[PDB]
Amino acid sequence: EPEDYGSQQWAAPSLSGAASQTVQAAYQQDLTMLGRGGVSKNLRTANSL
Amino acid sequence: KYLGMLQNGYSDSTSAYVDNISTGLVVNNESKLEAYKITRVKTDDYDKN
Numbered sequence A: 001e002p003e004d005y006g007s008q009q010w011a012a013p014s015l016s017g018a019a020s021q022t023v024q025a026a027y028q029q030d031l032t033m034l035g036r037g038g039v040s041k042n043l044r045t046a047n048s049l
Numbered sequence B: 001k002y003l004g005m006l007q008n009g010y011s012d013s014t015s016a017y018v019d020n021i022s023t024g025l026v027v028n029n030e031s032k033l034e035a036y037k038i039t040r041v042k043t044d045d046y047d048k049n
Helices: A020-039
Strands: B022-025 B033-039
Touching: none
Parallel strands: none
Antiparallel strands: B022 B033
16 A cells, blocks of 8 residues: 655645635646647746646 | 654755754765764754744
8 A cells, every 4th residue: 555645745835725716727737738639838837836 | 763864855844853863974084985974952942933
């Protein structure tokens, strides 16, 4: 069996920040770009965002 | 419990204490790597704020 990996890599966000509409819209746009197209503009996601 | 969290350039906040911090860095004097460890004891109402 494996162990926990991402528990200590998670930066706790504010409640307003986690529920922000911009973040969800950006993630959904990236997912749709991945699924239907494949263009990899801004290849690194810059995990600070 | 002995070493704490090894600092290697994680995300922006990520905290740094579990409740210790310890990691190695290259000394400026020469090309030898040293290791340092810092321990913190909370005080005067750290939990609030």
